[PDB]
UniProtKB/Swiss-Prot annotation, chains A, B:
Organism: Severe acute respiratory syndrome coronavirus 2
Effect ascribed to mutating residue 49 to A: Does not affect ability to cleave and inactivate human TRMT1
Residue numbers annotated as active site: 41 (for 3cl-pro activity), 145 (nucleophile)
High-level lineage: Viruses, Riboviria, Orthornavirae, Pisuviricota, Pisoniviricetes
Subunit structure: 3CL-PRO exists as monomer and homodimer. Only the homodimer shows catalytic activity. Interacts with host FBXO22; this interaction promotes the proteasomal degradation of nsp5.
Cross-link Glycyl lysine isopeptide (Lys-Gly) (interchain with G-Cter in ubiquitin) per UniProt, renumbered positions: 5, 90
Range of the intact protein held here: 3264 to 3567 of 7096
Subcellular location: Host cytoplasm; Host Golgi apparatus; Host nucleus
Effect of residue 205 to V: In strain: Zeta/P.2
Designated name of the protein: 3C-like proteinase nsp5
Ranges of the Cytoplasmic topological domain: 1-304
Length: 304, 304
């Protein structure tokens, strides 16, 4: 019993983190096989960041200008290329600690663990969600860029995020491991405003299911609703619309608890309309939306 | 910028987790040097748990009855002893992945990371606090016992907790790594009620400082108070009394923000008296008390 914001064990990713220095900028790199992945803005002066031409900046850089350090041992860079907003540095040594891995581009609402790193060394791990506006709310200081987000399926690390940017609003933007930004963001120190940060409805429902499983039930009501009726209320409260796909994904939690998805929707509706009245659910006074249905099943079943 | 409930990177601890089986009970063990530490109730039948005499139960057990598996390789048990509520199994192989480590007994209010494990395999990591009533609010299923809590200071893992027990209220009880329970709890399936779960005042203040550092300031007021006046309000709201020791520990956060500790106390006082009025601080609608002053300095400075 008990339900916690739970990150993946980070060890597999800890074994991939390196320091990348180009001139005066030190960032984090991800070492998989004989390739080190890092944000391309490693090549920028602070001045460069205001309006960089990465292709032009990169011409002035050689293999030997990229200083790659894994623990306190230097890696020999034998190649470099730019793919979208990441650099791939080819090194002469396969990372011996390379886990089985994949690069995945996640959808808004999907959760992942971040291994926050500084100078190629892990400081902490926490759980995030890709917001519907393609920002994440992280904990990232200067030097944290190149820190990665990931999921694990038993033995296979799926890398989904690399940290590149803090917006003036102190929310975070980054790329998948092909160097494509989530959302409309660019690796330039220019005013970029985030869109509406809507609540991830399917994640709130999964977390209400988690609450019932863990004994928090005060919010279960006598009502049901329809997808259309629920969606009118969701719109009004800046909740993402719920689709039949979401209902299908919640099926297993519905089955385990015996609470029809649309009944839980009606409970969420009354909570939106009535508030919490000073009460808590799983130690929270607001509706949590950074647990996926899969996250709730995993934590409630004890997958390793 | 951004402030997250952050766990230590778990890799150093992942390398210490083993499976312990005695008869039909499988739990987790911690392998440090040539010793495996596990909850002594590994030797109990479900029947035994109602009123076990551990010394008497242990007489019926030999080295070869303790099945210790690290990954998919069996360890040879060459000795066993009971220390308080833990077993120490001597094995013929030093754990090659043994980190620098210490056993520490933490105080109420202190935070730590839990590596939740099942069958010696990591499922997740999350951040906890020893509650003032010596429970923790964890996420622990059957098979999770022997999972450990820890802090890291650069290279040295300080183990502070081993999981043993869920109370009928679905809160958690365990031991330090000498096998001494936190609080008055016993490893017996009997009614044990937790005391008052008071709010860790010094931790709420540290987190209000973290909020100011991260730009959340709406709650800063025009008022100050005294330790005595603040403490009258704390008592009324089931907050732990604040001592000069707590004020001293908050000194660095006071210095960085330029907000006198007693001014922040007056802000916390108005929040207690007035509530949040539907507003949030660092994405929370209640006052968070599972960040220590040290935790706030660490996360805000990016220690590795
Ligand atoms: C993403 C990241 O970690 N970066 C990029 C932004 N950044 C700076 O431009 C910067 C340069 C120098 C100093 C003192 C602070 C910030 C920090 C690194
Ligand atoms: C602490 C822990 O993980 N335990 C101890 C309590 N426990 C049981 O007694 C138990 C036995 C058998 C079954 C099916 C469930 C629970 C679980 C293990």
């Amino acid at each position: 019993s008990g339900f916690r914001k739970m990150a993946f064990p980070s060890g597999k990713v800890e074994g991939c983190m390196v320091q990348v220095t180009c001139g005066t900028t030190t960032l984090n790199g991800l070492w998989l096989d004989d390739v080190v992945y890092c944000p391309r803005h490693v090549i920028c002066t602070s001045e460069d960041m205001l309006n960089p031409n990465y292709e032009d900046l990169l011409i002035r850089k050689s293999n030997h200008n990229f200083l790659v350090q894994a623990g306190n041992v230097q890696l020999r860079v034998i190649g470099h290329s730019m793919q979208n907003c990441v650099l791939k540095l080819k090194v002469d040594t396969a990372n011996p600690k390379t886990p089985k891995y994949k690069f995945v581009r996640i959808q808004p609402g999907q959760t992942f663990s971040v291994l926050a790193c500084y100078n190629g060394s892990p400081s902490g791990v926490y759980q995030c969600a890709m917001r519907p506006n393609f920002t994440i709310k992280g904990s990232f200081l200067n030097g944290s860029c190149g820190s990665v987000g990931f999921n694990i399926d038993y033995d296979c690390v799926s890398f989904c995020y690399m940290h590149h940017m803090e917006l003036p609003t102190g929310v975070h933007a980054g790329t998948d491991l092909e160097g494509n930004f989530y959302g409309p963001f660019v690796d330039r120190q220019t005013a970029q405003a985030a869109g509406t940060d809507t609540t991830i409805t399917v994640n709130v429902l999964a977390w209400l299911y988690a609450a019932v499983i863990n004994g928090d039930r005060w919010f279960l009501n006598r009502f049901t609703t329809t997808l259309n009726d629920f969606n009118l209320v969701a719109m009004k409260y800046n909740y993402e619309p719920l689709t039949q796909d979401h209902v299908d994904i919640l099926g297993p939690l519905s089955a385990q608890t015996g609470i029809a998805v649309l009944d839980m929707c009606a409970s969420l509706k009354e909570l939106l309309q009535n508030g919490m009245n000073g009460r808590t659910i799983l130690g929270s006074a607001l509706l949590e939306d950074e647990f996926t249905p899969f996250d709730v099943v995993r934590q409630c079943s004890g997958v390793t």
